[model samples]
Target: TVAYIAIGSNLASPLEQVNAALKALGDIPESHILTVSSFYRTPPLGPQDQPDYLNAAVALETSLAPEELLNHTQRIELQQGRVRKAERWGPRTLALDIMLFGNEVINTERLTVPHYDMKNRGFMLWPLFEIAPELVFPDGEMLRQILHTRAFDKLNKW
Candidate 1:
């Protein structure tokens, strides 16, 4: 399976944490990194009191099933010191979000592929485009098309 993952960190030395997460990703069983995007510094999506976030995206090819992949990612998160919290999209030590699982459209209680809000998120979309510019979502929409519709500066910075 070809998978795309979004990496984000805002706590505990964000850059190092994100880089470490990238290394851990490559160590997933039967998986290898295909490509990675340049690190992007972005404002937090919510709650102005938090620190800015360092984000990146990665592409992977793995033999693991979707749920299995989710399990691995969650485990990686736990290993990275992410504490389970009730707040959604809040600050964290690390976030390993599965953005795409091949071109398969999957909707389950535990996960959502194409990452439910990816279209509006430049943090996710831009880095993803960097690695897979010609990406086509399961719905047959191209990444470029969606990117064109959103303002660029709002979600990313150097």
Candidate 2:
């Protein structure tokens, strides 16, 4: 299956962190990272006082099931020193979010496929769009159309 993962960080060497994460992702069993988006500099979401984030998207071709892939990414985050904080969207060494897993739309409390908040986020959409311009959502919305929306109006490339 093809999956898009949202790669982000706001602390330490964010660019290096994201790049290393991508490289490490390629080493996960039963997975192949097809490509990755260039990191983009963006304002922090949720908490207004935090450091700006460096965000990117990774495309993976994996035999690992979605849940298994999630576990793998979480482990990598932990290996990179991620400590889940009380604050949502707080600075961290790494944040690897499962944005979409093929056309499957999963909705569990712990995880949501086509991620629940994905469409509303430029940090999420733009990078994926850069690498997947022809992608269409499970609902039939085009990635190209979504890219032009207000969500990405102020996005700046790093």
Candidate 3:
């Protein structure tokens, strides 16, 4: 199966964090990165008071089940110094979100495919559009259409 993931970092060097996350994704045995979007910098989505974040999206071919992939992503976050003590949506060293998973719609205690809120987040939409503009939700909606109504400012590229 293939999946699209959104990667974001608001601590330390954002570009470096993005790169490290990419490398970590590559390290997953059954996963391979297919394409990566140009990095974008955006203001924090929640809390609105923290540092900006560097974000990008990547497409991957992976055989791991959705929960297993989520576990792998969580491990990468912990390895990257992510701490859960902060308030909800607070700034972090790394944030990895599974955006799309092979056209499968899944809802479980641990994961959701097509990411429940993906269409609303420009931080995810823009980079996702950059890498896979033709990507459609399982419901057959184009990503660009979703981006048309969202607000986002593209920052420096990486």
Write the residue-wise lDDT of candidate 2 on 1-158 in tens digits.
Answer: 99999988887357677778888899999989898887788876688887788889999999888899999988889887465578646545688999999999888766789888888888888899888989999999988887775536745887
Clashes of 3: 0
- Candidate ordering by lDDT (highest first): 1, 2, 3
Off by over 4 Å in 3: 45-49, 84-91, 149-158
List all candidate RMSDs to the true structure: 2.4, 2.4, 2.5
Clashing pairs in 1: none
| Candidate 1 weakest ten by summed lDDT | 149-158
In candidate 2, position 22 carries an lDDT of: 83
Work out the TM-score per prediction: 0.89, 0.87, 0.86
lDDT of 3 by residue, 41-155 (tens): 7876578876778889999999999888999999998897465476656545788999999999999988888888877777788898888888778999877677765555545
- Rank the models by TM-score, top first: 1, 2, 3
For each candidate, what is the lDDT?
Answer: 0.84, 0.84, 0.83
Clash count, predicted structure 2: 0
Summarize candidate 1's per-residue lDDT along 1-158 as a digit string, tens digits.
89999988877367667777888899999999998888888875578776788888899999999999999999999898565478646545788899999988889999888789988788888888888999999999999888886656534554
Reference-based TM-score, model 1: 0.89
Better of 2 and 3 by lDDT: 2
